[PDB]
From a paper:
S1 nuclease from Aspergillus oryzae (EC 3.1.30.1; NCBI sequence ID: XP_001818636; S1–P1 nuclease family in Pfam, PF02265) is an extracellular, single–strand–specific, sugar non–specific, Zn2+–dependent, fungal nuclease with 3'–mononucleotidase activity with a pH optimum in range 4.0–4.3. S1 nuclease has the phospholipase C/P1 nuclease–like fold stabilized by two disulfide bridges. The active site is located in a surface cleft and composed of the obligatory catalytic trinuclear zinc cluster supplemented by Lys68 and the nucleoside binding site 1 (NBS1; also called Phe site in the previous studies). A cluster of three zinc ions coordinates the substrate/product scissile phosphate and the reaction mechanism utilizes water activated by Zn2+ ions as a nucleophile.
Coordination of the zinc ions is completed by four water molecules W1–W4. This structure represents a possible resting state of the enzyme.
Residue numbers in the entry: 21 to 287
Write the structure that this text describes.
Amino acid sequence: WGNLGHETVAYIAQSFVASSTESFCQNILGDDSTSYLANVATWADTYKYTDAGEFSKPYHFIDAQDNPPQSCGVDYDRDCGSAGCSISAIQNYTNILLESPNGSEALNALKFVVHIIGDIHQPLHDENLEAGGNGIDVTYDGETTNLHHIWDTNMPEEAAGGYSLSVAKTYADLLTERIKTGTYSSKKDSWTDGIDIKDPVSTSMIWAADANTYVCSTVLDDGLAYINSTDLSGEYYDKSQPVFEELIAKAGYRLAAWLDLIASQPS
Ligand SMILES: *[C@@H]1O[C@H](CO)[C@@H](O)[C@H](O)[C@H]1NC(C)=O
Ligand SMILES: *[C@@H]1O[C@H](CO)[C@@H](O)[C@H](O)[C@H]1NC(C)=O
Ligand code: NA
Ligand SMILES: [Zn+2]
Ligand SMILES: [Zn+2]
Ligand SMILES: [Zn+2]
């Protein structure tokens, strides 16, 4: 996702974490504001453009070598690659936070976890085809862009009504309501099935496989004849919106559950 998507995920997570988890995270981050997670949720996307952070570019993706829309699937050993991926990064940075939460690596580990759990939920962050749809040029509200970009940015910004941190906070409030009492309330109790702090690869792969199913059902199901030739701000956006909204919600809810496990101690 772009910045709005990441900040939205982070604000949702803030709404679900336990107080002890909040305190654990605020201490690591040096920030006890009511935007403590949201304020770091875009860091990985700036860091990757620097010489020191170049190595972390592949950590935003798992390039699933499936055959969408006919068939979708993610396989860790097949898809991660030698340079690492979102799944291997979740394992690395989660383990840093379990083993050395007071060390010098915890800060960036936590910022990575907050970001990357968001990215795992962007279906085209879990898809090899045309570099996750970057190579699929499209038209969106008259502008030339690509399919990856509209999932990261154009569509969630349109739905949220903007791109800023405050717009993200308002959007997060909306989606949080959907989880607690609204649209998602009767299904969110299954959204952490399979979660296991002792197995970050298994856990994150469940989430990645879930998001990747939407590459076939939603992202590419209209077929490339339609996608290449139709302005995607109309009916395409209409069908995409419930999907990216539920995935952003899932990302925040799952992020919060994961942070709770990271911070947890038996009293
Ligand atoms: C774990 O994270 C550290 C710090 O970013 C990095 O140096 C290291 O290569 C990572 N290890 C793996 C296996 O990804
Ligand atoms: C759509 O564009 C992609 C990317 O350039 C191409 O691989 C695909 O064949 C195109 N399909 C049609 C129908 O133009
Ligand atoms: Na521990
Ligand atoms: Zn992103
Ligand atoms: Zn992206
Ligand atoms: Zn990213």
